[PDB]
Symmetry: D2
Subunit: 236 residues, 4 copies
Amino acid sequence: HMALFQCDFFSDVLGLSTSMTVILPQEEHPTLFLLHGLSDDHTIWLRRTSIERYVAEMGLAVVMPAVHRSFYTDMAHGLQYWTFISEELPALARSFFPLATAREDTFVAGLSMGGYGALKLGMRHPERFAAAASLSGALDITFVAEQRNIFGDLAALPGSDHDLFALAERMAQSDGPVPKLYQCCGTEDFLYEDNVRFRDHVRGLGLDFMYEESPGEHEWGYWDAQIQRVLAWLPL
Amino acid sequence: HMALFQCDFFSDVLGLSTSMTVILPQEEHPTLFLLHGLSDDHTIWLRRTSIERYVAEMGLAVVMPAVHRSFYTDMAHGLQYWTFISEELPALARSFFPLATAREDTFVAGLSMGGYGALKLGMRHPERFAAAASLSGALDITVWVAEQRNIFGDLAALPGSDHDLFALAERMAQSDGPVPKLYQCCGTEDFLYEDNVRFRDHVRGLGLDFMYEESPGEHEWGYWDAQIQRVLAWLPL
Amino acid sequence: HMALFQCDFFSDVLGLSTSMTVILPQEEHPTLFLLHGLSDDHTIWLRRTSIERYVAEMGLAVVMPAVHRSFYTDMAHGLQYWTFISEELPALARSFFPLATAREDTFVAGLSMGGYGALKLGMRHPERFAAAASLSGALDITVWVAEQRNIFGDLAALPGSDHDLFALAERMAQSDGPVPKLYQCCGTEDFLYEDNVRFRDHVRGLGLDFMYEESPGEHEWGYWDAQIQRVLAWLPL
Amino acid sequence: HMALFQCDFFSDVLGLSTSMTVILPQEEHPTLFLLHGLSDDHTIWLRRTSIERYVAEMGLAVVMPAVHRSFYTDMAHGLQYWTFISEELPALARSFFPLATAREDTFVAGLSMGGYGALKLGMRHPERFAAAASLSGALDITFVAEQRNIFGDLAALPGSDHDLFALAERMAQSDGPVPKLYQCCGTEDFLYEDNVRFRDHVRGLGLDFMYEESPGEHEWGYWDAQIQRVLAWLPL
């Protein structure tokens, strides 16, 4: 059985009462941090997929937080959602629940915006994640007012620590352990062309990298199917 | 977009504070009452299937209540879960939410125990349901024995009783009044498969029109996640 | 009995899936929109007070939404939380639940940030609210500085603007149209006490009829739990 | 800050998916198991009192489970709610959350039916609880169909292991550590006379026992006030 937790807690980093959904195996569980997309909250994975069922025999906890429309970024005009997602949230989840801390037992995945977030986490903090997966990700954040609120000076984005293309090259230069990477996209997604460009870039860097594509749009039926393939791929 | 409601309310019939999950289309919606199985609560359909996504374009509300381990029965030793499910619960849902009341806009479906409950509702109150569907249903109800006695009372009196779907089907076969659209499915490896085949053969021999489907499967949520999509397409919506 | 609803719904104005808590009397209910403070969400009123009990005999619904750290403002750098709170949210609540629309049956109240929001609603839309109440409100809005800029834009342009409750009060004092019942309270040890005294003196000098109350207290929920009972008794219900 | 958890989990003892509400201090917390009354569920304490606020500075976790209309009893015709509340539930809560196991850090309290339940737990398992409190308790369960479903043969109740009057005498004969006991009741409660009888009985047994009464009915305003006094009395 999986136990389901709707958690209403305080974030000191955000200065905000907020929520997350956690599923735990019932008797230091390896943990998948599962990130939502643009306009989503912490409830969408549970509602629009059968994620709880898919993990049921894996001995795997899943943590599903909320980051509003932040692109997992410490916003130029907004709250500190990167510091939240990369530092405070995992700490809070580990303080509440019997979750692993070891890199080998820690994974991250997300769709769209959360695919960007997952790869950013894996590549900025390779020492914290064994695997990072993007589903139909917004993988090129280079460039309107909302984007400026998130990133600030848009012209400063290429080559920055926000730029997954540059982050991938930096991670590939590490000599320490780095996460395995997974990327998928539906071939009719508006983000498909960005995905192809990222794939062609990241696959030449000597990384442990898996790409998949098939018919699909920016749509939950596609992610319900694909998340099962991500789960099978996790180095659990 | 569908709006999701976790509802904590009081049941006068049960004398108990309890809960249900409701999903509503966002702008008198036709409503599917979607019943849980044995050991489940009002959260299982949302958790183990993508039901909210499956209904998203249908203009269909879904009401998922809890009845504990009652088999949708006014228990001989327990609470009045049949009066709750058949009378109070739909009234409460309609009082809270912009839900239809008309027979033509009212449907019920369930797995296991809830498949029994759905067909019981459809055959006891055919005037209230346009359609009733059972998925891997516990369709023959004739520590575990003690629990059955708590639910049904004298077990020897069950055959032919108003609890017995086989008897209810005989009533329906002779009815001149409204008969709901009726659906039955089961996985061929389910422990309840034999009971399902016996119920199917019974209703078919009576002339009672059912859509019957079977395919490989056990008593598990992968099968119901797939099958509920077929039930949704089949609803006379 | 009151029924409790945790509602997860989509806001088109915000472009965001979000949540609210609603309590409904169990059988077009008059409705109190009850606003949270700075750093709070839609759950705090239920958790830190006995609001559900306090309204239980009033035939009054309560809607408790979330606006993050927005000060109920269409942010210069952020989302449109004023259009959300003043337009979309009441519409959504009324679409989901059997809530009144009439001015005479519509009230708003809030603490801190939400007291500012309540009085902003009452004074910008006096035709929509029979009453507006502020509890320990942040009634003068003229890292923290950067956040204020994200909310309000050019801070130097705030005095006299449509964000400025002092200016809105001047409009109301000259209005021939409907004016809501208005309430203001604050604990005498609250950091916001001085701002509250300045707002009180301003509106009193204008002739704008407020019930004003003060007593020992800080910016904390014990005080609001006590004071919300007085606000409830004061509502023109 | 307190973090709030709505927990939907499976009970093997009950054979049932069920729920509880838990509040945790935010950074082995001592834990108060806080029991609901007749017709209540696991949500009523949070809704009708300010319990979360009252415990906010205490370093105290609160666990609020659901037992339906069972009187915290392994029912003669029903489910095993005593085995659930006394064995499975605390184990599950301790498996999910960072809660203490030590007797010295474990307390129980409840209103009505849950006051009966709390004292039954304290007196049947003195080795597990440092303190047990009843608020407007249904403290005399001696004797309709529902009562028979709960207790079975009603004539067998006097002197039984269901009978708090007898349990109190048995606990007072223990030589090992036993919980401090608290009892209160509103003077206009229908249960007042039963409470006076229990008080007069239990206060002559050499126990650590505190009684309080004041005007009140079987009503949440009274319990909102009284639970604060219980919290101050806990040997925390």
